[model samples]
Target chain A: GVALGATRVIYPAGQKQEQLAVTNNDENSTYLIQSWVENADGVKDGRFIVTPPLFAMKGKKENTLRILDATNNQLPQDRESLFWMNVKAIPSMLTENTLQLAIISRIKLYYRPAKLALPPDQAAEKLRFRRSANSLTLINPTPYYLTVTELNENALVPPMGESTVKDAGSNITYRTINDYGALTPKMTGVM
Target chain B: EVVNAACAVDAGSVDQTVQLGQVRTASLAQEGATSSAVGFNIQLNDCDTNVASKAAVAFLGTAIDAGHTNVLALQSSAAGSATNVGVQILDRTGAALTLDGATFSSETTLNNGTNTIPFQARYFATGAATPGAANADATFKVQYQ
Candidate 1:
């Protein structure tokens, strides 16, 4: 479990076309992860999920964010590909009006079965996986605002009576089901 | 013993008259000792031309309580406007009865091409009370021409 270093990003104070680099020292790390716009202050104000081709990274290496300004164009205008990194907060970064950003790049332990699992459900549904199963791929040509948040470290406890057994005349049967998953927390701003 | 009372009228007669002041009492029993009251019916006959002049029928010496006195006039006219017909009931003292306007209407006229008209007048007691005990009386008057 080799952890990747934080990819230093230099987004213009308020400009939308800023570019930032995403890197990982571990060759085993095949994806570049970035925090969602929700994880940052004064970013995207609307509730939206970073759709496919905008939330993924590739090649187990470094990448750059090329922000595209499509302010005047129709929605979903072509821009550069961008990936979101989910970062944890540092106590020292907590100020009166700021949020601390710490990188916790997600990696997929399984890939072959993961890529095959994409199209059946929407991106919003896949992000709710109990465990990080697959990496997201960013290939869209639009300016998509990506959002990422700190993954809380609480253990998911299965609900009671989720499993049951029934006895037949000659045999007994057993069943087990899993419905646990991670959920996004709503964020509030300080004056 | 019970006597069935009867009154006989002359047959084949062009006119019949009952003299005034003639007293006739039909003994009517109170069924099963129940409280009862008596009523009277007076009949008059006159030609259409004479109906308007002045016609009167008297119930002489009849006991009429102020509460239970009632009078009714039924007249038929052969040739005259019903507008000229008037019926009135008066106590023996010559005071006219207070007629109930609700019970009186000229719309009730019976019309015939020959001007023969039949009219009815009705009166009833003001309240539930026994008639006068001895000598109270009432009269029905008709005036038409």
Candidate 2:
């Protein structure tokens, strides 16, 4: 099996590329690693190019996946865009008459453009929630995506978008993903 | 927009062949019999604290059968392979490690430099032991938080 450097990736705006480290954990087994970039619709995306997309990774070794941006100012500069970076590690046949499974690890890749209306730390605070009898509507007023990391309320509020959840009360406790792919402290608010 | 944290830790030299030299058939006379364990260490060197603070290890291998998935099956393709025998990998507490590969062993706090994870390997008799040569292989992955 192989492990990626991070659970999610952040591609800063105006940067030429970003590097991701992939490590083969097996000492004796080698894996054929395949990597690609995809859009939110699960389509093969060309805006970001993965260098050395296919290669053999030896056991106990480290390999870097260099992601290059190919978009020619086509992506929105005000809001953040999201993509998926998929890495599939296919193990080689080490033992006959046994089972081997190829593992795929997927992580979110956020392309953040510079100079948004508000900073990332303030994005979570600006969220407004409308509460009904048995539902809650989450409104993301900021230009950044706000991910609600609460049990049963796991939802991503897109930039300037709204998402409704059933069975959610007026009082909500939630957390959001920050710019560095980390979760913020749990916040509590009344609808 | 680069994430300040990562899970990538440099685990140096992932593989080792434990030589369970010269076992007598009389030692493993019956099914589910075992031999002494050979100890080894999985070493990780120069781990940056900023990159990852803690790590764990996972073993992955083809099991002898579905019932005994934790026991590694011997290389049947190799000539002079032993029969009715398999290899068992154990953690520091002498508990057998699973071959599922997804389950990580106990967590170890990583430092700024080198870290050592202890393990052992031994031959286990899957059936009435018959000997020619006993050898097995496994792969390990390192997980981090």
Candidate 3:
């Protein structure tokens, strides 16, 4: 598999394009690279696009892939937008049986607003946290996706679960199957 | 008489680093008993606001040495790395957390963000284990939706 270059791709929301590079590491073979973008909505996205959807790399060579933000995602100018970059690399020669295959790589692709007041690194600190009657809520006042992890409270069920709130002023409520009810940019989650 | 709860979560190319803590070689020789379990917390910082709430798992990777799936191996020659012992992450109550989906693993729902799942890592002795430094790498992957 060729290196996906950076661990992630960052597109300054105001910019028209961003460049990602791919390099083959196999000393004796070649890789056919194909790339695309998708979000929670699934593949075939128009907000972000890629070029040379297909290309080739041989014996430790490198090539560039172009990404574009069409500027029509309805994304808020005050926050960040999250999408995914998917790449499929199939070797030029099949070495195994009839079931030979390639490597598929996917990583987060974040779009940043050029003039946003906050930096990506500082966004997590401002999230609002609250606990209510048998539930959990995370209010992301920032425009970026909270992308929270390890979310849990002391009092949740064995089968506790998750739910994501949408829109710029969104929140998520962590709840379980028996949740009675559950808020505002303050996501109310029961679990 | 168990000690922990159901839990899961992983990630942050936000470039955050977590130190799972350290373990001693002597206690591992005790065998199956949960020993010297040090509590540590892994958190993803600076969350995004708008996406629907969802969950993911860390999908811990296997060791370079296949026989040692139960232990995280010591990396060779890296600074401050211990030897003859591998680190095994355990659920909150000191139960084995499966590094891979095999044995010693339990399924739990990991959060979307702004949460902290408490976990522990202990040194476990392996066959012919020499007590040399063992360090392993597993990227935090949000494996579930």
Candidate 4:
């Protein structure tokens, strides 16, 4: 099994999280892995036992994954796993503005048995016992600095110390207790 | 000087010288039973010579007949009570003369003496009910000199 075209990377658009199906696209290739042993051979009897693997893309943060049946009920025997590699943001070339992207590496997924029989009242409770899946979040905790400029002559002029542009950027970078100085007589009168 | 005459009257008479005297008398007798002297008399009997004599006497008496006459120029006898008493000498126009009160003595004269003579002789308003005093009256006595 030469890894079959990178698992047919199914990319969904504009979805924060989605449920996916892994069907056998080649019906004649019957050998499948099962029962938690990696690369294990299928039993020679006529049972086609393939354990489905779950995949997810969590952009720069943890995301929750859920496995549901046709009725949207959770399956038992759910399994959750995490990815440990560095994840990159697919660059979008739509704008010239500088953008800060979230950094993430791993995805956690859950799997559960698709078929089970229980009292209809106990079905929802049994589903709640299924494992939960999550995405790993990596936040850039460093403060973002901005350059200030005046909008004159289509050129960037360094902001003056007294300019409102400087004050706005300073507010983003520094946790300062502003004194507001003494209120001006004009200001107090207006207020 | 008679020889011739004697011879003529020798037969009848001789020549005689008879002397005569003049005499006067006054009677010293009463004529009636009362024997009052009826008229004045003088008794002188003896006269030796014819010479003049003189005698003098004096007597005095008063004769006044008692009667009434128009005496007073102005008289007023107020007996019991009087106010002002005076002879108000009015002029021909009947206005009193503005004379001094001393010139009018009888105004205000009061008869308070025992003889009903005036205690005062002057003009006065008596018996006037002086606002707060008792009732009193006065009399006027006036005598013209």
Q: In terms of DockQ, which candidate is strongest?
A: 2
- Model 3 score (lDDT): 0.49
True contacts kept of 1: 0.00
Evaluation by TM-score, superior candidate among 2 and 3: 2
In order, the Cα lDDT scores of the candidates are 0.23, 0.68, 0.49, 0.16
Q: Interface RMSD of every candidate?
A: 63.1, 7.1, 17.5, 99.9
Per-residue alpha-carbon lDDT of model 1 for A1-191, expressed as tens digits?
A: 11222122322222445443344333432332443333223245222232221344433454553443333432221222222232211111001111111223221100011113233122222222221123222211112222222222111111110111111132212111111112233322111
Candidate 2 backbone collisions, by pair: A25-B140, A27-B14, A27-B15
**Top-scoring candidate (TM-score):** 2
The stretch of ten residues in a row with the least summed lDDT in candidate 1 chain A is A91-100
lDDT per residue as tens, model 3, A49-144 = 888899877776778889988858577665566677766665544111011223444556777666766664554455555545554455556655
Second chain TM-score, each model? 0.22, 0.78, 0.57, 0.15
lDDT of 3 by residue, B12-63 (tens): 2111223434344555554443336656554422222111122244435555
Error of 2 at B122 (Å): 28
> Candidate 3's error at B38, in angstroms?
38
DockQ of each: 0.00, 0.09, 0.02, 0.00
Q: What is the lDDT of residue A66 in candidate 1?
A: 46
